[PDB]
């Protein structure tokens, strides 16, 4: 086991585990550092690290050392044998946790037993060389005062102190010659410094500290990990594998753009997590094989080692044994060591994937921000870990005995406040970017607010080279992930392998390099006239000598006057929360400007499903102006148009190299080798698609998430503050009463403050939510369809490169030349599914990829919209849309396809989406209005069939044609086999739902089935088993094609494509979608107008229609003419028939040209009777359940009603649509509804039944029931002159 020492700082130094240490950037010189022996091989020296810094640098000062951390300077820290003391203590316990788990032991297991290599890459094969700096460190035996005696020791791991900056942690390697024995598979001295004390701050981005703004907010850490993150450090200089390779270095060419080191791939695998998604598959195997070559050397060193030139008392033996177990080389029964690449793989994961600071915290129930990545906050400082009350060994903070174990409780800064004290800002240091106009007004942004973005040159180019296939060639894939539990059931990993002793001859040769360290300035003055997210999140701020503030819609007087805040909440919001009030009226305002945050705050929520977005933030364009300027126009419209991209402050520059060619090596006379060279191409192949789309996850997470990730905080910024205006101003207005008439106000801040912070939350959820789905999209429509592209072309080059070698040697294949022929073209047909869990194991990435994939909306491909008078895709795939002169188009999305050649639309899709799916998967929808047949030209009608819409590659895909009454759905698969499924509707009916009229057809493909859905109902079906594969990405062709006659036209709408088949579930509620309007709809199922001319119809009276009755003003019910000539093909009844009637607006006299009639609008109902126009009326004043409705000229009459208002009270879609007449409008008293009712006669010479145009209470009720009854007397439908219907 691993035991800790015990000991004060006062205690004798005994030369053996409390020495006088000679460190190693000490050069052999200087005074000596009383170490304290914590554990074998490790020490503790209480003191600052001065090596490479100036006494000065100690005290804060304008500059800094990290551009990338809030710096904290106390030069006092340890200047008291006391405070030496505490430290010792403090390490001591440290530790003591560290081992309380089996992890974390044998972690210091590995450390303690990983001694460095005796000597480096000078030292020659067949030596060990004891004399170096990074194997050997003295101690001073003689007597105080005199250096007279030195005696050396071995060593894996000395401690420090803080150096200038106490909360900037870090592990140091010894390099000698410019080079680092840590680094190349020796290992070598580990050095830190570290402070357990002042602790950093971080708060989980996407969730709230303790759902609290007004109150403390985020976590702080449990000194324990920081310790065992340094510590894994250590574990890698220890065994010589702190590999230096490709560092993701950030782009700082733009003044937004966020300064930092370059960071190599070894800190992100040691934080763990997704940073190491960051570090592409390509420079995984890189880092690899650099490490693994490292160790041929050391295993080769083993065969020759022979002697110790510095020791002659070393014993050669005993060190080739603890180096074999050490890095688990093997041994056969004389004593050769080799490689062995199984033990060696688990080892080298257990060493970069399975002690990561991640595994470490989850294991430990602590608490750590979630990604590198992430802004950092001021440390804090902790009050005391030597009191068990506050931290103990075995929970740290979270101790249950405290309600602090569950949700992290005990690092809650908003809860655990007895544990930790804020630091003076005065003893800060942060690198600051000034933003200054040409004039000339400043800002300072902490260089941590900025965007960080990856620079291309980040990312490994291997994948542009070229591959030798071989019979032998096999796959690599490096699994950036491990098992934490073997490691810690692990039998073997912890070396039972006595450890040699550490006393050994003194160092002689002190030759080392020292780093020099120096403060650079901690603000960086930029020029710049823009006015992008960190100038809006400033004009939201105001001055802390300030407290009368009022908010502003406008930008520029916020950023000018002091007095004036920035909101981007509505405009009625602003007002209200500017208002002053009467001390009686106050509480109410407090109520009412709160009550109006919240709801503004949460339209968050709004949805946008017409335009296919179930999510939109409105405000968030107002709110930072982030991007391409979105803080001007409106920015759904602007989102619907462009998407995610809009948001981004930067659209990064990609690296997708053609991927190299392959190699195949030829064997004459030999089917093996042969066939070998052939299959290991094939999933080579697919190592190439696995690492493209690394490369692509890599370079998402590293140049687009992050700055979404902004983006999000900056939400979260943006909405606190505007909760401090808030706050602010009902301060001021309260205290401007004087005290006794505050003593009758009855207000609660913290409830404020609580109603505030709720909304903000709410809002906060909506916004990430939203966010992350930008996010998602744009990896998937941006980003991995311009590698399937390229991958796609790769896979084309290696397919005639493998038929073109399937044939060179055609004859060492004989009987199978043509059997792996088609083996090749099968393999490389279906393309692998890009799938986010193979390239990271981040629970929260995970469920952004699911989510985005379980939302059907993100399986549209095609979306064709109106957009500034032309047609263009929105689906995000960029399709390219050619409307030609011919095409007729609308703001209410309808195009008209007429006879005329320029009359056609083209449509390239985008080859880069996993369209074929190899068994045809995927939908179409859209509305379509087919004119009535001209009865003298039934013939040609119903016998020519044309085409409407054509997508076709190559003599495969589909098509959409019309055969007279009846629209066709074919498929032609490669082969040529065709298959349909087709609607025809009826066109004998008196009244059809289809001829002329406006309907929603949609279809649905999958492997068995080809399903055709009108108005959301399944109507046809067509087994399609035998159809083969189908290319459905060709061009699309809209254009009527066939043997039409001149006149021939079609309207359409809302034309989009799905790579999914629509669930009936889907196409309803799409159907349900697209015919929503808050205007009503006339017969055709167009919009219904005013001042149009109109014949009534009736859908409980099909056949009837209304005319003025010759001899009293009321309107008889007559039956509809009908199909006069004799075609046995058709039959209808005639629809221009009866008054016509016109619809006459009631309010605002802006006259009588033309306009929409909206739900709940109030009317009058006219009709012409020869020259005039006369009115429907009722009578005020009658008793029964129903009544005759009065026709005649227009007039103001005392005893009738004459107001109108058009009613919807279908949930369901429908053309149909109620008049009501009530009392007034104000009033709710219901006159009734118009409708027809059947009355008796019986005259001196006639006895019958007529139906008259009536108005009854009776509807009233009956329009309630569900569902709703179609069928009703009192449901109405407008009927206008169309083209598209002649009789
Ligand atoms: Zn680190
Ligand atoms: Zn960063």
Same mark, same amino acid.
């Given at each position: 086991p691993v035991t800790i020492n015990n000991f004060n700082y006062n205690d004798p130094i005994d030369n053996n585990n409390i020495i006088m240490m000679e460190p190693p950037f000490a050069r052999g010189t200087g005074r000596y550092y009383k170490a304290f022996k914590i554990t074998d091989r490790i020490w503790i020296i209480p003191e600052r690290y001065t090596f490479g810094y100036k006494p000065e640098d100690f005290n804060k000062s304008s500059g800094i050392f990290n551009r990338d951390v809030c710096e904290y300077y106390d030069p006092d820290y340890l200047n008291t044998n006391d405070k030496k003391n505490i430290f010792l203590q403090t390490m001591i316990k440290l530790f003591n946790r560290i081992k309380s788990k089996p992890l974390g032991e044998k972690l210091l297991e590995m450390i303690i037993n990983g001694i460095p290599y005796?000597?480096?890459?000078?030292? $020659?094969?067949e030596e060990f060389n004891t004399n170096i700096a990074s194997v050997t460190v003295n101690k001073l035996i003689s007597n $105080?005062?005199?250096?007279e005696r030195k005696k050396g020791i071995f060593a894996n791991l000395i401690i420090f102190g803080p150096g200038p900056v106490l909360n900037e942690n870090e592990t140091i390697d010894i390099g000698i010659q410019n080079h680092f024995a840590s680094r190349e598979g020796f290992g070598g001295i580990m050095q830190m410094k570290f402070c357990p004390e002042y602790v950093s701050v971080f708060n989980n981005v996407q969730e709230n500290k303790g759902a609290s703004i007004f109150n403390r907010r985020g976590y702080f850490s449990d000194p324990a990990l920081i310790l065992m993150h340094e510590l894994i450090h250590v574990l890698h200089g220890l065994y010589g594998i702190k590999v230096d390779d490709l560092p993701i270095v950030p782009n700082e060419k733009k003044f937004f753009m966020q300064s930092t080191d370059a960071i190599q791939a070894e800190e992100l695998y040691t934080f763990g997590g997704q940073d190491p998604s960051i570090i592409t598959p390509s420079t995984d195997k890189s880092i690899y094989d650099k490490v693994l070559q490292n160790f041929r050397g050391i295993v080769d060193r083993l065969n020759k080692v022979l002697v110790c030139i510095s020791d002659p008392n070393i014993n050669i033996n005993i060190y080739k044994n603890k180096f074999k177990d050490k890095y688990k080389f093997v041994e056969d029964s004389e004593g050769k060591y080799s490689i062995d690449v199984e033990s060696f793989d688990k080892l080298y994961k257990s060493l970069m994937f399975g002690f990561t600071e991640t595994n470490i915290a989850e294991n430990y129930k602590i608490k750590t921000r979630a990604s590198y990545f992430s802004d950092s906050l001021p440390p804090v400082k902790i009050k005391n870990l030597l009191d068990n009350e506050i931290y103990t060994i075995e929970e740290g903070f979270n101790i249950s005995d405290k309600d602090m174990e569950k949700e992290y409780r005990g690092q809650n800064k908003a809860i655990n406040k007895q544990a930790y004290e804020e630091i003076s800002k005065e003893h800060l240091a942060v690198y600051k970017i000034q933003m200054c106009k040409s004039v000339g007004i400043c800002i300072d942004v902490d260089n941590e607010d900025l965007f960080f973005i990856a620079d291309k040159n980040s990312f490994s180019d291997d994948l542009s080279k070229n591959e030798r296939i071989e019979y032998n060639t096999q796959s690599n894939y490096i699994e950036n992930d491990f098992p934490i539990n073997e490691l810690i059931l692990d039998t073997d990993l912890i070396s039972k392998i006595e450890l040699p002793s550490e006393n050994t001859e003194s160092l002689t040769d002190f030759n080392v390099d020292v780093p020099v360290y120096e403060k650079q300035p901690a603000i960086k003055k930029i020029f710049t006239d823009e006015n992008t997210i960190f100038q809006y999140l400033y004009s939201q701020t105001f001055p802390l000598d300030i407290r009368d503030i009022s908010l502003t819609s406008s930008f520029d007087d916020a950023l000018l006057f002091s007095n004036k805040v920035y909101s981007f909440f509505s405009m009625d919001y602003i007002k209200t929360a500017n208002k002053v009030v009467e001390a009686g009226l106050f509480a109410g305002w407090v109520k009412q400007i709160v009550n109006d945050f919240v709801i503004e705050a949460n339209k968050s929520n709004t949805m946008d499903k017409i335009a296919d977005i179930s999510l939109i933030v409105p405000y968030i364009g107002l709110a930072l102006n982030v991007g391409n300027e979105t803080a001007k126009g409106n920015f759904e419209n602007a989102f619907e148009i462009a998407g995610a991209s809009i948001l981004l402050e930067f659209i990064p520059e990609l690296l997708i190299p053609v991927v190299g060619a392959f190699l195949l090596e030829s064997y004459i006379d030999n089917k093996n080798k042969i066939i070998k060279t052939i299959d290991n191409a094939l999933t080579k192949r697919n190592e190439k698609w696995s690492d493209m789309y690394g490369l692509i996850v890599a370079q998402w997470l590293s140049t687009v998430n992050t700055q979404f990730y902004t983006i999000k905080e900056g939400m979260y910024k943006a909405l606190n503050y505007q909760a401090q205006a808030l706050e602010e101003i009902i301060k001021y207005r309260y205290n401007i009463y004087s005290e006794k008439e505050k003593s009758n106000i009855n207000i609660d801040f913290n409830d404020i403050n609580s109603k505030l912070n709720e909304g903000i939350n709410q809002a906060i959820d909506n916004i990430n939510n939203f966010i992350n789905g930008c996010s998602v999209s744009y990896l998937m429509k941006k980003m991995i369809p311009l590698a399937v592209e390229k991958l796609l072309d790769f896979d084309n080059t290696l397919k005639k490169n493998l038929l073109n070698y399937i044939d060179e040697n055609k004859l060492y294949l004989i009987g199978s030349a043509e059997y792996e022929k088609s083996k090749v073209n099968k393999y490389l047909k279906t393309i692998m599914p890009f799938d986010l869990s193979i390239y990271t194991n981040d629970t929260i990435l995970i469920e952004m990829f699911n989510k985005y994939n379980s939302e059907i909306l993100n399986n549209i491909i095609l979306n064709l919209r109106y957009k500034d008078n032309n047609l263009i895709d929105l689906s995000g795939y960029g399709a390219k849309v050619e409307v030609y002169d011919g095409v007729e188009l609308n703001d209410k999305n309808q195009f008209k396809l007429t006879s005329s050649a320029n009359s056609k639309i083209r449509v390239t899709q985008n080859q880069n989406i996993i369209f074929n799916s190899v068994f045809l998967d995927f939908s179409v929808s859209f509305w379509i209005r087919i004119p009535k047949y001209k009865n003298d030209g039934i013939q040609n009608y119903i016998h020519n069939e044309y085409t409407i819409i054509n997508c076709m590659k190559n003599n495969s895909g589909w098509k959409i044609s019309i055969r007279g009454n009846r629209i066709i759905w074919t498929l032609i698969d490669i082969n040529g086999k065709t298959k349909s499924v087709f609607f025809e509707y009826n066109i004998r009916e008196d009244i059809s739902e289809y001829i002329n009229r406006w309907f929603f057809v949609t279809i649905t493909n999958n492997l068995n089935n080809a399903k055709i859905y009108i108005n959301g109902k399944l109507e046809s079906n067509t087994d399609i088993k035998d159809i083969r594969e189908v290319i459905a990405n060709g061009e699309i062709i809209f254009k009527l094609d066939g043997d039409i006659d001149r006149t021939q036209f079609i309207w359409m709408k809302y034309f989009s494509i799905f790579n999914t088949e629509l669930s009936q579930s889907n196409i309803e509620e799409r159907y349900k979608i697209q015919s929503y309007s808050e205007y009503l709809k006339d017969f055709w199922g167009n919009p219904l107008m005013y001042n149009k001319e109109y014949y009534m119809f009736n859908a409980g009276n099909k056949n009837s229609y209304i005319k003025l009755k010759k001899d009293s003003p009321v309107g008889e019910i007559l039956t509809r003419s009908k199909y006069n000539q004799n075609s046995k093909y058709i039959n209808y009844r005639d629809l221009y028939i009866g008054e016509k009637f016109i619809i006459r607006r009631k309010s605002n006299s802006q006259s009588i040209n033309d306009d929409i009639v909206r739900k709940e609008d109030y009317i009058y109902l006219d009709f012409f009777n020869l020259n005039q126009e006369w009115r429907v009326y009722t009578y005020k004043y009658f008793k029964k359940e129903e009544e005759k409705l009065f026709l005649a000229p227009i007039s103001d009459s005392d005893e009738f009603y004459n107001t109108i208002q058009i009613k919807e009270y279908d949930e369901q879609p429908t053309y149909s649509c109620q008049l009501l007449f009530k009392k007034d409008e104000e009033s709710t008293d219901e006159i009734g509804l118009i409708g027809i009712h059947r009355f008796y006669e019986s005259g001196i010479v006639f006895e019958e039944y007529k139906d008259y145009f009536c108005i009854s209470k009776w509807y009233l009720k009956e329009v309630k029931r569900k569902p709703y009854n179609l069928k009703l007397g009192c449901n109405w439908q407008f009927i206008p002159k169309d083209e598209g219907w002649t009789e």
């Open positions: 005796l000597g480096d890459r000078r030292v $020659p094969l $105080p005062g005199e250096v």
